[PDB]
Write a protein that binds this ligand. Sequence first.
Ligand SMILES: *[C@@H]1O[C@H](CO)[C@@H](O)[C@H](O)[C@H]1NC(C)=O
Lengths: 48, 49
Amino acid sequence: LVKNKCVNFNFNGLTGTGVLTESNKKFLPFQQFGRDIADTTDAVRDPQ
Amino acid sequence: LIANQFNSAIGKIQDSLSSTPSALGKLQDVVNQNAQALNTLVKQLSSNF
Ligand SMILES: *[C@@H]1O[C@H](CO)[C@@H](O)[C@H](O)[C@H]1NC(C)=O
């Protein structure tokens, strides 16, 4: 896992481009993805 | 008397602006229109066309 560097991430099918940073948001145990108002990926939980 | 009326009128403006939420309707409408146009433009990427 690499943080604070612009990389290509494939977290089981996200297949998106962006820089990954630590977040204070808390997900539900079953929840994996994250979306904003515009239905764009905003935060993803590390599978490991 | 005029000084007191002026002060009380400004205080009433203070109270009316603080209480009523729809006071800044023009600015809120402009901001909402711009944000909604931006949201529609962004959502247009998800359409097949
Ligand atoms: C996933 O596997 C690694 C390697 O064995 C381990 O260090 C890690 O704790 C595992 N993840 C969880 C949530 O246990």
